[PDB]
Design a protein around this ligand. Structure first.
Ligand SMILES: *[C@@H]1O[C@H](CO)[C@@H](O)[C@H](O)[C@H]1NC(C)=O
Ligand SMILES: [Ca+2]
Length: 496
């Protein structure tokens, strides 16, 4: 459950947040496969509650009504079509599995679901699955309100409602089987793994019992004995009774300290500086690298809806964001996930975005298609960070330097650092308020290299900065603190 199951050479997955299945299928063929992306995190593919007040928010998808593959992203046929086409070009699909709960208890009964399924939160009836009052933790939760009230009590965190979401009794074999039935349907369709949403709110043992019921990956695309990739969403920062290490036996875990600390370092908050990143990784108290799923931001915290809070960097902070993503993709620690978002009208009031609920670009609730502009950027308000030259090229950089050791580190005791990956890559950063101009040892073979941040290597020449590495491996780098992108990266494949 620890291996991503990506094909040899591809080292990152991208979260195509709220994208339609048909757009993802196309993206796999026209961009993801050609550019070397390993896979895609898709939004929950199962039927959810259609919420109209506010108008179709992104979070309505974390509020399940049934396990029918029918949502605003498409129907079951379109979903299957997407998985098949993506797999055919070597790009894996990972499903966001919302299995800790069903919808909010206050939600009105009726057929206001993305597929018309009937449900009644009040009486605990979800006939489409089916689930009844016997399948929820109502009688088990001991809090006066029925919701989680204290996170210092590990029992309550697991058995009570996360902000009202009806909590499934995961210890019952019936419930475990209905969930496995759902997941095995997806595995047999061809998905390579799952993101287990809100794993902190589930007992490690209940998760294990469910995973024991899972099939091996589809033998038409994967080698026999392939187990699904499992990454657990567990927000573990400062001391809480629950630790992310309690979930290592089930698969990988999201390391939220990664994005939070990288954000404060790049923003230079609290007197932190890039020179401190010398021992980035486990040395900073993070989980072991082989159990970590890392990222700069995710769909929750990019809109202040989660762990990391104010320090989190997003596409809104373009310049610093690219630098953070650059550092992440170049550093050997963990398995990396790139974010791909959509724009929403941020409107801050007293320090809080009152429009953090806004769902994906749409026309009367119907999600808009991702349009590709002549310069490969996207239209219809999709940000497509994964298409930004700076990020796309660093995704490739990671593939090229895969397996190569962290070495040749340099720092000026402040905010301009550099390091290489074996003899396959080298990257330099200038985050100080003054220019950087120095000759550094790169460990790369002599030659002329194209800087992949400022440009590309297009048929025999570089469209941007060019770096010259001598016989002894040294090379001169000059980065003005005024540069559009204050960092340079070169690798074995950008060499002329
Ligand atoms: C690189 O570009 C120059 C013109 O700027 C041209 O003279 C040269 O032949 C090009 N090299 C290749 C390999 O295309
Ligand atoms: Ca629970």
């Amino acid at each position: 459950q620890y291996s991503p199951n990506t094909q040899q050479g591809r080292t990152s997955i991208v979260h195509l947040f709220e994208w339609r299945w048909v757009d993802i299928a196309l993206e796999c063929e026209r961009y993801l496969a050609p550019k070397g992306f390993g896979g895609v995190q898709v939004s929950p593919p199962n039927e959810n509650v259609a919420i109209y007040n506010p108008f179709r928010p992104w979070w309505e998808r974390y509020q399940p009504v049934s396990y029918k593959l029918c949502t605003r992203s498409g129907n079951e046929d379109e979903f299957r079509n997407m998985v098949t086409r993506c797999n055919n070009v070597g790009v894996r699909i990972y499903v966001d599995a919302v299995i800790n709960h069903m919808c909010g208890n206050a939600v009105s009964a009726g057929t206001s679901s993305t597929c018309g399924s009937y449900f009644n939160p009040g009486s605990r009836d979800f006939p489409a699955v089916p689930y009844s009052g016997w399948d929820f933790n109502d009688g088990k939760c001991k809090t006066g309100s029925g919701d989680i009230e204290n996170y210092n009590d590990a029992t309550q965190v697991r058995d009570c409602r996360l902000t009202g979401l009806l909590d499934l009794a995961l210890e019952k074999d019936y419930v475990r089987s209905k969930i496995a039935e759902y997941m095995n349907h997806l595995i047999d369709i061809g998905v390579a793994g799952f993101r287990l949403d809100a794993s902190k709110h589930m007992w490690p043992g209940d998760i294990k019992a469910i995973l024991d019921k899972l099939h091996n990956l589809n033998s038409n695309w994967f080698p026999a004995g392939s187990k699904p990739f499992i990454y657990q969403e567990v927000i573990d920062l400062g001391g809480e009774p629950i630790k992310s290490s309690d979930y290592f036996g089930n698969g990988r875990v999201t390391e939220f300290k990664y994005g939070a600390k990288l954000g404060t370092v790049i923003r230079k908050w609290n007197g932190e500086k890039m020179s401190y990143l010398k021992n980035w990784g486990e040395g900073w108290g993070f989980v072991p690298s082989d159990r970590a799923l890392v990222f700069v931001d995710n769909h929750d915290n990019q809109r202040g809806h989660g762990a990391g809070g104010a320090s989190i960097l997003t596409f809104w902070d373009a310049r610093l964001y690219k630098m953070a993503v650059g550092f992440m993709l170049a550093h050997p620690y963990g398995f990396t996930r790139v974010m791909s978002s959509y724009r929403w009208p941020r409107q801050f009031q007293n320090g809080n975005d009152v429009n953090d609920w806004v769902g994906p670009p749409n026309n009367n609730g119907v999600i808009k298609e991702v349009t590709i502009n002549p310069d490969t950027t996207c239209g219809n308000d999709w940000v497509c960070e994964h298409r930004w030259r700076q990020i796309r090229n660093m995704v490739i950089f990671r593939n090229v330097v895969d397996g190569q050791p962290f070495t040749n580190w340099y720092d000026n005791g402040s905010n301009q650092v550099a390091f290489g990956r074996g003899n396959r890559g080298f990257i330099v950063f200038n985050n100080d308020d003054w220019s950087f101009s120095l000759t550094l040892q790169t460990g790369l073979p002599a030659g002329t290299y194209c800087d992949v941040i400022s440009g590309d290597k297009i048929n025999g020449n570089c469209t941007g900065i060019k770096i010259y590495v001598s016989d002894d491996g040294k090379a001169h780098f000059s980065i003005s603190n005024s540069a559009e992108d204050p960092f340079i990266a070169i690798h074995a494949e950008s060499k002329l």
